[PDB]
């Protein structure tokens, strides 16, 4: 019998992505895929009924209907999950760790998830050694890091 | 037989300030089925007989709570409880990384005369993914 979708958590994410989703069902199976509007994403299996994906970025703020698709046929047409992008605006602390947790490099033998600690102290270290440098690739550095900022919020 | 359990609790980690919603992932759940944050009971609500919605309660102290299920008085996943992991903005190791961070990020026009953690995080975030290809 083909996957069902029964529930997202949350329903709701900004549009920058990168958030972890929860997809709730049943008959999932590894290798799913899920498909946000039009975007596909791969997912870690959880359980039978549970399912994990990281949301992908969408350019304009809104619903989409979420489906299920593996080996490029699709589930769920008929009967779509809804998941909502927003804008983002103010930063927050939670968004600034995600955003980390993405960012930071790992050095080897990491867990898979990086303590908060770490975060901070790895992200410290390469802001310091940035204080250090040539100047002409601090310019530069500045100036891309400007762009990054511009970009994700407006 | 048909006794509730508990496969996974995502996220897996929240703020004591609480508040988090989390959803607990397992078999044989049931309208009434009550969940447990070491001996508070916490709100939940039944999504599916494998999904329930609960809501994190505030804690004094960080550390790992056992999270169980409980159905009048009868208390189920003793053996193998679910684990949520809590964390505070105030651990040293912690304020340590923010107060580092308080030094070496950049000042634009208009900065407060401390910078709050949001944006320490941004501005991190933003310089650290830049550094890349460097």
Redesign the interface.
């Known amino acids: 019998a083909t996957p069902c979708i029964?529930?997202i958590?949350?329903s709701e994410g900004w549009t920058t992505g990168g958030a972890?989703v929860?997809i709730?069902?049943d008959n999932f199976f590894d290798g799913l895929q899920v498909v946000f509007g039009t975007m596909l994403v791969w997912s870690e299996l959880?359980?039978p009924?549970?399912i994990?994906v990281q949301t992908p970025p969408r350019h304009i703020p809104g619903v989409v209907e979420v489906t299920l698709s593996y080996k490029s046929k699709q589930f769920c047409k008929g009967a779509p999950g809804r998941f909502v992008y927003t804008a983002l605006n103010?930063?927050?602390?939670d968004?600034?760790?995600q955003?980390?947790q993405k960012?930071?490099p790992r050095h080897p033998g990491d867990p898979e998830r990086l303590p908060?600690?770490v975060?901070?102290?790895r992200?410290?270290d390469?802001?310091?050694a940035?204080?250090g440098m040539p100047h002409n690739?601090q310019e530069?550095?500045?100036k891309?890091?400007?762009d990054?900022?511009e970009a994700l919020?407006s």
């Open positions: 029964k529930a958590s949350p972890t929860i709730i069902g959880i359980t009924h549970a994990r103010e930063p927050t602390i968004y600034g760790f955003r980390l960012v930071i908060k600690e975060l901070l102290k992200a410290a390469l802001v310091e940035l204080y690739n530069i550095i500045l891309r890091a400007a990054i900022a919020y």
